[model samples]
Structure formats: structure tokens, C-alpha cells
Target: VYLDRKLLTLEDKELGSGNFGTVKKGYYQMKKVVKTVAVKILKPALKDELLAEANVMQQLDNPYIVRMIGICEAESWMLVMEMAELGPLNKYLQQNRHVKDKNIIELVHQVSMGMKYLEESNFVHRDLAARNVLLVTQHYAKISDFGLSKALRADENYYKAQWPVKWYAPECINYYKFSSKSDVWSFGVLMWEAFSYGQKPYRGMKGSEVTAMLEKGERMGCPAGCPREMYDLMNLCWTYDVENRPGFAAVELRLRNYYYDVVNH
Candidate 1:
């Protein structure tokens, strides 16, 4: 729905910035209460896509997906969404050294569950990564940034995703092809980052060199002290053959069962 542009007030400060846009903290005035929100200001190139993203977000209803409040065009293009109070996953992990093991597991688990929902709904979030996953609380993580996401019909299994080479599967890089499998590969890298407490994947290597290494059948070393089971899950996601990788459904189940065991033990 188009918000009354006049009622949305943006603060001068930005929470984050990229070439695409600046995410600023803001307030949306409702009749009885003011809602704290994050407003993404877009350049002209992004305006129409912002509207498209808002429409897509409206149709999607999942607890682990970031909730879009509405869109506003008050002298500027503003896409408002719920504030992820703690911010991006990798950044949060970097700052919180003493964070509980189970908490991290739970955060990743929530992300798996979100992707499972998107997968079942026929939407491929072409941009699923630790940077795109935002933490509302230490225990809660949600999938954000639907800019590269698209929904597919049964007749089409692959969509062209075109880049972000390092985290992508070979088929995506070589053929501009993307499927849930490519997303699984990205998720694997996300797991590596989360477990490594924000370490950049292929840390010392250039993006140009990653594909050669991947074809050589080398994966990143396991993050220090991460559970054997979880690292194994990351390996499962990084399976060279796209068909061999586990789907988000299986990923979520493995995570859920593991989380249960953690609680039980």
C-alpha cells in the first residue's frame, strides 16, 4: 500500500549506505502510536524496483522475512520497513564475542526456516547472505533485501542471477543461472561467515581465484570450534553438483533437530 508520504519523517543520519541506497532510521506516524522504522532512500534507477520489491514483500507473510511497512514518495523515494534493531548478522557476530553458542545456532536456524518458506513459495532470494540477514534480537534473524529475488513457476527452474561471484555456485557464474541450489551455496558461505564470527569468505583470495579453488574441490577450513554437525551442513550446501545440495527444507530440519538436541543436552 502507498503510505501517506507526509506522515513519514526521516532522521538525517544513515544506519547503513551502499551505492544503491542509504538506509536511514525514521519514524512513521500512525494514529495512536509512532512506529520506529528503517527507511531506504533510493536513486531514480532504484525507484521502480523499490515499488516492485514492496509489492512482493506485501504478498509474502513469514516471521523470518523482514516486514515492509509501506512505500512513500514524499519529495524523495522512501521504502520503509521494520527496523532490525541489532543490524546485520556478520556485524553483530563480530561485536559480540561472548555470545552463546546456541544463540548463533538459533539465528542460523531461523534463516534456514525463512528460506524454506521462500523455497516452498517458489521465490528464489538471489541475494541470501549474512549481510542481507538482519538481526532484530540476538535470538531472531530475518531475511532482508529482496532486490534480487524472483518467484518462479513450475515450468522454470533456473533464473538468471548474473553476479556476486564468490558466494555463487558454478552454474550461476558460468551460465547466469540461479536456482535454489545456488541459493544453498550462498547459504553455505553465510554459515561460514557466521561461524567464523564475520570472517570474509575466501579471506585472502581474490574473487577471481575462488572458482578455480572450488573446482579443485577445496572448501574453506571449518571455523574454529563450530560444531561438527553444523560445519557438515555447510559442506552439504556447498556440494559442487547443484542437484546434490540439500534444499532449505532439509537444511531447516537438520538445524531444528540439532537445536533440539542442544536444548536437551
Candidate 2:
């Protein structure tokens, strides 16, 4: 906690907003050094959660996770961080459906690599969907919204934790339990999201419907034009037994090999 209140300046442009807070495009100025940044404004009730998030972001210094500039307490509660150039991964894919498979694999691999770092750090990103990922450039995307899950888990909430049922492992849905393995399950869905250019997984099914279907061993169909090897890996991630799912390191390795094979061959 170093408080750098005067260095941050927010513009009218909002990067994004959600139940946790609003992110605005801003500039961080410290003497002659000025840099563009994203300023997240948290509510008064979320101050404690914001501090906890700042602590986690401070420790995380990976290329694939958004960097936290510092915490601020000026006009409002805030958490300043590096700005994502292309916004969310979902929006990027939605607007660029014609992107080549090689590029899509690269973006997906970056996400898995980021999660690998978190896995080694013994952190489980409860939200790993494409919507929670931010794009830096055409070939780069970083995992975002990592520490915000605390706000969802807080008491006196306006809404229940709307767990993305399509992505949750069976155990997670049945017992409300979470682990790095649960994130692996979500990563599989994220692969579908990328390969299909942001198509919803388990499309047309209600949450209850997805639960019953999953309990019976039904899995989502492979995305159109997705390579068999990639689809096979996705299936491995969705295994009912948590012990069977591959770790993020293993997943990242496979994705790297797959991307290399496609690009060089």
C-alpha cells in the first residue's frame, strides 16, 4: 500500500463496467513520466475487497495478467492498472470472427500461460471466461478479473454468485467447491469460446438443463473447424473426475505444441 492519489487522472471514456466497479480510461502522471492506464472505481462497500485485490495484483507481475499500477483514494475508491488496448477477449473475437485459426490458438495459449503462472502461485481464478480476459494486441490476451471474485462472495450481496454453469466442473456445481481444477474446466469452455468466435457454450440450454446433461456425461460438440487434437484436449479438461483434468502447465504445453505444429507444418 503506497497511496498515489495525485498521479492518476481519469477521462470520460469508460473501459468497462460490472457489478464490482467501473473502469475508465485514464492517465497516470508521476513528474515527467506519464502513462495511459485503466482506473477502476469501486464503491465504498467494496473498499476492503479493493485493498485485497490490490495486494494480489501487486504480487502478480506476469506478462499475461494485467498489472496493477497502485492503489488510490482521491475523488473515489480506485485501483489503477495498465490499460488493455483491445478491451475484452469476447468483444475482440466477436468483432473479428474471420481471424485465422493460428492467431486464435495464439490468443488461447497466452491465456493458458497466464493461468499457469497463477497455478504455480497457488491462486485459482474463479472466473476464467473469455469475457474476463483482456486483449493487449491482435495476438496477445491477458487474464483479468482475478481478485474480483471476493466481491461476488461477499455477504449482503445484491445478487447470488451466478456461476457460469456451462464452464463449472460437476463437483463445483454440486458442492460449490472451487480449485485450480475447476478453472481448468472453464478453460475448456474458453477454448470453445475462442474457436467458435465467442459462441456461447451449451447454447440454448438453461443452467439446470446443462447440469443434468453434464451429470449424464454429455459434453459440448466440437467447435466448427476446430482441430481434432485441440478438441481432444478440451474433452480431457472436462473430465468428470477432477483428478483427471490436466494442470494449466500441462494445458499450456499442449497448446504451445499445437500452435507450433499448425504454424510450421
93: Cα error in model 1, Å: 0.7
Clash counts for the predictions, in order: 0, 0
Off by over 4 Å in 1: none
Model 2, which residues run further than 4 Å from truth?
148-162
Q: What digit string (tens of lDDT, one per residue) describes model 1 on residues 1-265?
A: 6788778888887888776778999899988799989998884557778887887798899999999998887767878999989999989889988777688889999999999998888888888889889999888899999887887767987786435677888888778888887888999999999999987889878876998898899999899989999899999999999887889989999999999888786
Clashing pairs in 2: none
Reference-based lDDT, residue 139, model 1: 86
TM-score against native, each model: 0.96, 0.90
lDDT of 2 at 77: 82
Candidate whose lDDT is highest: 1
lDDT scores of the candidates, listed in order: 0.87, 0.82
Candidate 2 residue-wise lDDT, 110-223, digit = tens: 999998887777666777898888988888898887553432233321112345778788877887767777789999999988888888788899999999998899899988
Q: RMSD to the native, candidate 1?
A: 1.4
